[PDB]
């Protein structure tokens, strides 16, 4: 009777996307937990690198929170049984509050980390005298607090409704927007604009300035050989490639997600055909895959290039096994 509300897709694609999500879950939780332990172990001369290690700890914690808070619930009742919504009444809006607070936390952590890398490389002498560990802890708790308070419109706009043809039905219960279409359009536009356009602009501008400056330092070191010469230019080239990798991974991971939310909020009910319905749900699986890639690709960037960070990490895995 509620068969029109059902989403009908090929079940083997559901099995594939479930296996990909389990793989991303185990890799991301392992990477971010052992990243937090490795950043906890570092204890020798904390003056100004403790700032960046607190930023890396905040970013790994936010990715771990995206994975742990999001993956089981969205996996279960957005991939397998979206129809009954077995979780319940206030859990709908609480769950969107948690997911969107975690999304803002990861966005502002990558943005703040780019800000701190800019302060450390391009204006290096002022970063010691100006910024402090108290200043860094203030700034990190401030961006976590701002990520908490931005997600409150997603707490108001989301809620349970009963979209069955009948008034009461067990499978009728769904977890949708409840407020008027113009209002939820404003909320999704502000969410998309802030959580994508503001980090993408600051990441693009700052990481491009940093990569330009340390490519100038590459040209300087190759111009004028020394004892650490073939180590320094390799360090700087891998720094350039980390900066471009963070920018490109940010775009490729979080553009299709906001494209999905925006093409939800724009397209009116007259334009939806069942082709767009089915394309939306396959697009939903694809975009949440590209979304959960970003929670995993942060410890991979650190173990790739930092040789100090690599050894403590692989010894920590050797201690566990």
């Amino acid at each position: 009777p509620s068969s029109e509300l059902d989403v009908n897709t090929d079940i083997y694609s559901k099995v594939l996307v479930t296996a990909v999500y389990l793989a991303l879950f185990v890799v991301g939780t392992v990477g971010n937990t052992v990243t937090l332990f490795t950043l906890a172990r570092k204890k020798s001369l904390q003056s100004l690198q403790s700032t960046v290690h607190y930023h890396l700890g905040s970013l790994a914690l936010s990715d771990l929170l995206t994975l742990l808070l999001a993956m089981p619930v969205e996996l279960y009742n957005f991939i397998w049984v979206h129809h009954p919504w077995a979780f319940g009444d206030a859990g709908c809006r609480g769950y969107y509050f948690l997911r969107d607070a975690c999304t803002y936390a990861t966005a502002l952590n990558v943005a703040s980390l780019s800000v701190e890398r800019y302060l450390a490389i391009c204006h290096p002498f002022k970063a010691k005298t100006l910024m402090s560990r108290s200043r860094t802890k203030k700034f990190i708790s401030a961006i976590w607090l701002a990520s908490a308070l931005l997600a409150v419109p997603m707490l108001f706009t989301m809620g349970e409704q009963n979209r069955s043809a009948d008034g009461q039905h067990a499978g009728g219960l769904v977890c949708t927007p409840t407020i008027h279409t113009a209002t939820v359009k404003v909320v999704i536009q502000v969410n998309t604009f802030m959580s994508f356009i503001f980090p993408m602009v600051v990441i693009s501008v700052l990481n491009t300035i940093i990569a330009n400056k340390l490519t100038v330092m590459v040209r300087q070191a190759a111009e004028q050989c020394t004892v650490g010469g073939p180590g320094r230019v390799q360090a700087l080239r891998h720094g350039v490639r980390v900066l471009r990798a963070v920018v490109i991974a940010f775009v490729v991971c979080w553009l299709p997600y906001h494209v999905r939310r925006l093409m939800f909020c724009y397209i009116s009910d007259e334009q939806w055909t069942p082709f767009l319905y089915d394309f939306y749900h396959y697009f939903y699986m694809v975009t949440n895959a590209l979304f959960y890639v970003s929670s995993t690709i942060n410890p991979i960037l650190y173990n790739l290039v930092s040789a100090n960070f690599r050894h403590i990490f692989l010894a920590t895995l050797a201690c566990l096994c």
Binding site: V7, F78, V174, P177, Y277
Partner: peptide
């Protein structure tokens, strides 16, 4: 037929 999952 608007999809409802966001």
């Amino acid at each position: 037929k608007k999809p409802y999952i966001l």
